């Protein structure tokens, strides 16, 4: 899973078998650290028009 | 992959296959290339109940 985002702590609960974690779209709104098996909360970097 | 979606539901059986919703979580996804086209359960217990 290669992408760009703001990795952050997630309060979400990924049931044991739950590897990744898309949302109402297709965006991996969360990942489980290969190591440390932690539920991260990948979110896109803050862009915006100027 | 021989998936075994098991939910050991901790609910009562007032009646069989009761109503409600019980999602099943996979327990073992056995990778094996095999053609199962039959099936059978076992009670082999010596003191078969
Ligand atoms: C598996 O066994 C069935 C029953 O004999 C047979 O019809 C089927 O073709 C077999 N599958 C494979 C791997 O060809």
Curated annotation (Swiss-Prot), chain B:
Subunit organization: Binds to host ACE2. RBD also interacts with the N-linked glycan on 'Asn-90' of ACE2. Cleavage of S generates a polybasic C-terminal sequence on S1 that binds to host Neuropilin-1 (NRP1) and Neuropilin-2 (NRP2) receptors. Interacts with host integrin alpha-5/beta-1 (ITGA5:ITGB1) and with ACE2 in complex with integrin alpha-5/beta-1 (ITGA5:ITGB1). May interact via cytoplasmic c-terminus with M protein. May interact (via N-terminus) with host bilirubin and biliverdin, thereby preventing antibody binding to the SARS-CoV-2 spike NTD via an allosteric mechanism.
UniProt organism field: Severe acute respiratory syndrome coronavirus 2
Protein name per its UniProtKB record: Spike protein S1
Effect of mutating residue 16 to G: In strain: Beta/B.1.351
Positions of glycan attachment: 35
Role played: Attaches the virion to the cell membrane by interacting with host receptor, initiating the infection. The major receptor is host ACE2. When S2/S2' has been cleaved, binding to the receptor triggers direct fusion at the cell membrane. When S2/S2' has not been cleaved, binding to the receptor results in internalization of the virus by endocytosis using host TFRC and GRM2 and leading to fusion of the virion membrane with the host endosomal membrane. Alternatively, may use NRP1/NRP2 and integrin as entry receptors.
């Amino acid at each position: 899973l290669t992408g760009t985002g703001v990795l952050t702590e997630s309060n979400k609960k990924f049931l044991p078998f739950q590897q990744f974690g898309r949302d109402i779209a297709d965006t991996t709104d969360a990942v489980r650290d290969p190591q440390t098996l932690e539920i991260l909360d990948i979110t896109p970097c803050s862009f915006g028009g100027v | 992959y021989f998936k075994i979606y098991s939910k050991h539901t901790p609910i009562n059986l007032g009646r069989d296959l009761p109503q409600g919703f019980s999602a099943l979580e996979p327990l073992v996804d056995l990778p094996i290339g095999i053609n199962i086209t039959r099936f059978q359960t076992l009670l082999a217990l010596h003191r078969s109940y």
